[PDB]
Design a protein around this nucleic acid. Structure first.
Ligand SMILES: Cc1cc2nc3c(=O)[nH]c(=O)nc-3n(C[C@H](O)[C@H](O)[C@H](O)COP(=O)(O)OP(=O)(O)OC[C@H]3O[C@@H](n4cnc5c(N)ncnc54)[C@H](O)[C@@H]3O)c2cc1C
Length: 456
DNA sequence: CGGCTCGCGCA
DNA sequence: TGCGCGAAGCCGAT
């Protein structure tokens, strides 16, 4: 498709056709940012060769109703910042509301677009939208992987069983795809109020707000400032203050020593490639650098590999054969406790460590990476069936996590409950051969009282 | 055949 | 606290 610093393997054609005379439309979805965006850079390079301008279109679907206000505000406030950023470079943005399959097909014809570009996402509803758009448009339709360092269809062509199998593949293509980003060139040609979409959506999600007894909201929105500018500040402080002690205190929820980048990385407000570019150049603890790189490279992109090659990524059928056989044999085992969704949601279990994990999820919208395993694994231990446990874990994960509705969530829940990307362990009642995690093992690794007293 | 992102005993 | 074994099924290099 042309360009000096542009790798042609990051782009693949979804539909071939005669390139129109109008501008190039970039259908923004996952990577909501202006800097370090391959999809936005590829749309500008195409527009430069065709002597056309580049426009951005964002379709606001009804998916914000299944979520909550904490995710809707975090996204809308970032889109307000992105509008001024793109407007500074003479790039206009259009914000549509409704079905992307019907709205973007109408936008391409109404605006007489010449080439449509979109970003990559392995989720089901994105592939369903792209198929409906292809059937209604007559212009070329391209797809760019701007989220992963190595494109998903390039790192592997099949489902990866474990990380130590996917690890040598990723690090082998790293010297080719780890490159610096060129600056976005402003538009030479210039061819819906976000404040109203914010107030309308908030009033519709007000009854579903998570409250306390005194009708006070549980969400604390001052923990993570949304936007592209704030996301870069979280990156800088992590590499300057937290990266040294990461490899030693990454599993201690009493110490705020993780990167805290998952809410920004989910909405695409910060590029993981930019994070790797800056972490690699830093001089820090070599063990901590290798530990953080293994999280943002393999485990982040193997989760995209999981959902892209397993369409039932949120179902029991995606589990390995050994895990399904073990879970099916222990279906009739008597459970120590049985809790419904409402009891798991409000945090009314006998385990104070589990309840404290749920309060962190409800109050801050981001539960610590270590306690998320204890949170999900105990849901499987105290549920009717593995299907209900998978249902409850996915529901609370997508409802209250700021990084929810993300491939890392479904892969992480499939790891905790279904042993995906994991191996078998000692045979137990109810759980079977799935990895076990107890309250006593957490007491030997960190001060469990400080974590419980912090969140009641 | 080697080695994979827990619990547990022992310094 | 950090280290080493145990319990377990399977991929992938040959
Ligand atoms: C049951 C369960 C549910 C999860 N739900 C989500 C979710 O909804 N959204 C989400 O983005 N992540 C999810 N994760 C993955 C992981 O918990 C988060 O990425 C992490 O805890 C967020 O904090 P952090 O980015 O500061 O951690 P860091 O240690 O700083 O992580 C660095 C980055 O590496 C990646 N990463 C780290 N751990 C994982 C992992 N286990 N799997 C995949 N990528 C990882 C993420 O991009 C993360 O931003 C879940 C994990 C589990 C076990």
């Amino acid at each position: 498709p042309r360009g000096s610093h542009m790798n042609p393997k990051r782009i693949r054609a979804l539909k071939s056709g005669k390139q129109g005379d109008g501008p190039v439309v970039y259908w923004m979805s996952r990577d909501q940012r202006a800097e370090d965006n391959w999809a936005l850079l590829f749309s500008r390079a195409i527009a430069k060769e065709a002597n056309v301008p580049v426009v951005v279109v964002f379709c606001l679907t009804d998916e914000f109703l299944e979520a909550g206000i904490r995710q809707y505000e975090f996204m809308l406030k970032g889109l307000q910042e992105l509008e001024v950023s793109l407007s500074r470079k003479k790039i206009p943005s259009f914000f549509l509301r409704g079905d992307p399959g019907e709205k973007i097909s109408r936008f391409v014809k109404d605006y007489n677009a010449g080439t449509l570009v979109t970003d990559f996402s392995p989720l089901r509803i994105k592939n369903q939208w792209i198929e409906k758009v292809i059937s209604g448009i007559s212009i070329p339709f391209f797809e760019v992987d701007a989220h992963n360092v190595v494109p998903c269809w390039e790192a592997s062509q099949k489902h990866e069983y474990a990380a130590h199998t996917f690890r040598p593949k990723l690090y082998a293509l790293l010297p080719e795809f780890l490159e610096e980003f060129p600056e976005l060139e402003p538009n030479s040609v210039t061819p819906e109020t976000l404040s109203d979409v914010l107030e309308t959506g908030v009033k519709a999600l007000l009854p579903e707000r998570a409250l306390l007894k005194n009708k006070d909201p549980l969400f604390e929105p001052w923990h993570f400032e949304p936007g592209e500018k704030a996301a870069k500040k979280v990156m800088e402080s992590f590499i300057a203050d937290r990266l040294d002690s990461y490899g030693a205190l990454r599993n201690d929820p009493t110490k705020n020593m993780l990167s805290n980048l998952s809410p920004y990385l989910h909405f695409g407000q910060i590029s993981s490639q930019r994070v790797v570019l800056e972490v690699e150049k830093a001089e820090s603890n070599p063990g901590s650098k290798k530990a953080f790189l293994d999280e943002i490279l393999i485990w982040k992109e193997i989760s995209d590999n999981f959902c892209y090659y397993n369409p039932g990524y949120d179902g029991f059928e995606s589990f390995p054969s050994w895990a399904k056989e073990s879970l099916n044999a222990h279906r009739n085992d008597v459970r120590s406790h049985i809790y419904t969704l409402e009891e798991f949601e409000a945090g009314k279990t006998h385990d104070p460590l589990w309840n404290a994990s749920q309060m962190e999820l409800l109050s801050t919208g981001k539960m610590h990476g270590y306690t998320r395993m204890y949170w999900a694994k105990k849901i499987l231990e105290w549920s009717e069936s593995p299907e209900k446990a998978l249902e409850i874990a996915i529901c609370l994960n997508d409802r209250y996590e700021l990084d929810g509705r993300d491939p890392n969530g479904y892969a992480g829940i499939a790891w905790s409950i279904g042993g995906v990307h994991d191996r078998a362990w000692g045979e137990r009642e109810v759980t079977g051969k799935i990895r076990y995690m107890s309250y006593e093992g957490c007491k030997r690794k960190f001060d469990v009282k400080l974590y419980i007293e912090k969140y009641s």
